[PDB]
A paper describes a structure:
β‐Glucosidases, major enzymes that release glucose from various natural compounds, are phylogenetically classified into glycoside hydrolase (GH) families. In this study, functional and structural analyses of a GH1 enzyme from [name] ([name] protein) were performed. [name] showed the highest hydrolytic activity toward p‐nitrophenyl β‐glucopyranoside among p‐nitrophenyl sugars. This enzyme showed hydrolytic activity toward β‐1,2‐glucooligosaccharides specifically among β‐linked glucooligosaccharides. [name] is the first identified β‐1,2‐glucan‐associated β‐glucosidase in the GH1 family.
A structure of the enzyme in complex with sophorose (β‐1,2‐glucodisaccharide) was obtained as a Michaelis complex. To obtain a complex structure with a substrate, residues Glu168 and Glu318, which are candidates for an acid/base and a nucleophile involved in the catalytic reaction, were replaced with glutamine and glycine residues, respectively. Because soaking with usual concentrations of Sop2 (approximately 10–20 mM) did not yield sufficient electron density of Sop2, crystals of the [name] mutant prepared without Sop2 were soaked in a cryoprotected solution containing 500 mM Sop2. The overall structure of the complex is almost the same as that of the ligand‐free enzyme, although the space groups of the crystals were different between the ligand‐free and the complex structures. In chain B, the electron density of Sop2 was clearly observed and the Glc moiety at subsite −1 adopted a chair conformation (4 C 1). In chain D, the Glc moiety at subsite −1 adopts a skewed conformation (1 S 3), which is often observed in the Michaelis complex in GH enzymes (Nakajima et al. 2016; Tanaka et al. 2019). The Glc moiety at subsite −1 is firmly recognized by multiple residues (Gln29, His123, Asn167, Tyr267, Gln363, Trp364) through hydrogen bonds. In contrast, only a single hydrogen bond is observed at subsite +1, involving Gln229. The six‐membered ring of the Glc moiety at subsite +1 is sandwiched between Met171 and Trp291 hydrophobically. These observations suggest that substrate recognition at subsite +1 is loose, being consistent with the disordered electron density at subsite +1 in Chain D. However, the anomeric hydroxy group at subsite +1 faces solvent, suggesting that Sop2 binds correctly to the enzyme in the crystal.
Author numbering: 10 to 410
Write the structure that this text describes.
Amino acid sequence: KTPVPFPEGFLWGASTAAHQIEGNNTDSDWWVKEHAAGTHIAEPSLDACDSYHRWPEDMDLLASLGFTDYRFSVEWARIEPVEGHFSRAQLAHYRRMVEGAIERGLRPMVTLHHFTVPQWFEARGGWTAEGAVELFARYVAACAPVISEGVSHVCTINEPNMIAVMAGQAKRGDNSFPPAGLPTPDDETTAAVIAAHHAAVKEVRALDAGIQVGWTIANQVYQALPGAEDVTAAYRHPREDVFIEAARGDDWIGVQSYTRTRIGPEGPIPAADDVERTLTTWEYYPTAVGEALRHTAAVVGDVPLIVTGNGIATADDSRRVDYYAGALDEVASALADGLDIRGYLAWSALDNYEWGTYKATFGLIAIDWETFERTPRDSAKWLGSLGRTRELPRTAALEHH
Ligand SMILES: OC[C@H]1O[C@@H](O[C@@H]2[C@@H](O)[C@H](O)[C@@H](CO)O[C@@H]2O)[C@H](O)[C@@H](O)[C@@H]1O
Ligand SMILES: OC[C@H]1O[C@@H](O[C@@H]2[C@@H](O)[C@H](O)[C@@H](CO)O[C@H]2O)[C@H](O)[C@@H](O)[C@@H]1O
Ligand SMILES: [Cl-]
Ligand SMILES: [Cl-]
C-alpha cells in the first residue's frame, strides 16, 4: 500500500561470481568438469563475460545506473593455483577490484568462495578430506590484503546447502535431479562446510577491520500442503535450516531466493503443467523472497538479513520488471513488519554462465558472447534509479490490516 524507504546504509546492487563472468578460470574443478570425458555439462564456461579484463566497465555501468553496491567473488583456484603456492599477482588483481569499486562509489561485498574450488582441492578429495577446513581457513587468511580496507561485508561460502546437495550426488554417483526438491545432501559435507565457515569467520574477524561476516543460503521456499508440515520440516532441515542454524552467531546472513516448491505427504510436488515457468524450468514466483526472508528470520533470530541473490531467467525484460516489482514489494512488506533487512542485491549484474548453460539469462545487463559488449536492459535502468531514490515501490495490490 505505501512505499518503504531504504533503512540507513541499505545495500542496493547486483551480484556476480567469478566463474560465471570472468572467463578463463582454468584451474577450477569446474573447468576440468566442463571438458572431462563423459561430462554431462551442456556447455563450457570458456571466456564467459571476460570480466577478468572488463570488471572496470562492469562497475562503471553499475555506478552509472545508480546502484551503490556490488557483490563479486574472488577465486581460490586463481589465488592458490597449486596447493601451498599463493599468487600475490592474483591477490593484487582482486585488491584492484576492491579499490576500483570504491573509486567508482560502489561499496564492494566480497564473496570469498562461490562453488568452484581449485582442481587440486577436488583431486585430494574435496570438502570432506582431512585438512580441508585448515586449507579453506588459510586461503581466507591469505585474502587479508584484499579485504582489510574498504570492505564492510564479506561472504565466506556462497550457498553451502548447494555444496552439500552436489556432494550427495557425487557420493552416490547420481547425475540427475528429482522432478522436484533437492537431492539428499551429504551430511559429511554439511559438517565440513559448517566447520570451514566458522574458521573463516574467525579469520576475517581476526583482521580487526570491522568487517561484517556471514554466508548465504539457497532458500527453497518449501511450502507444506495442509497436513504435510512434519514431512516439510524433515525435508527442509538438512537442505536449508541446518545452514541457517549454523549462522546464528554471524554478523549477517544472505538470503537467495528465486522460486518455491510445494511439499505433499509423499514429499516434493513439481510445479503444475500449466503454471508460468522461467528459462530455468522453475515456476515463476515473484513473491518467493518474501517467504525466504521470513523463514530465514524465524530460524536465524536477529542476525541482519541481506538479499544477496534474487531474480529471473527470461528473454523478456518486461517480465523481469514484473518479477522485481513483486519481489521488491515483499522486501518492503518484510521491512514494514520489522525484519532487520540491510540490503538487496539482484541476481545477476550480468548475463553469465549459469553452471552449464548460457541460455538462462538472469542479467540486468545483456552480454554479447562474441564481442563482450554490455547493454543495460530497462530493468537495470529502473532498479538502478532506486539507488538514488532509496525507496521501495509497492505493487498496487492490497495488504491485510
Ligand atoms: O553415499 C550414500 C550416502 O552417504 C551419506 O554419508 C554417510 C555418512 O554420513 C556415514 O558416516 C558413512 C558411514 O560409513 O556412510 C556415508 O558416507 C550421505 O550423507 C548421503 O548423502 C549419501 O546418500
Ligand atoms: O541459479 C541462479 C543463481 O542462483 C544461485 O544458485 C541457485 C540456488 O539459489 C537455487 O536454490 C538452486 C535451485 O536448486 O539453483 C541454483 O542455481 C547461485 O548463487 C548462482 O551461482 C546462480 O547462478
Ligand atoms: Cl602461485
Ligand atoms: Cl573461491
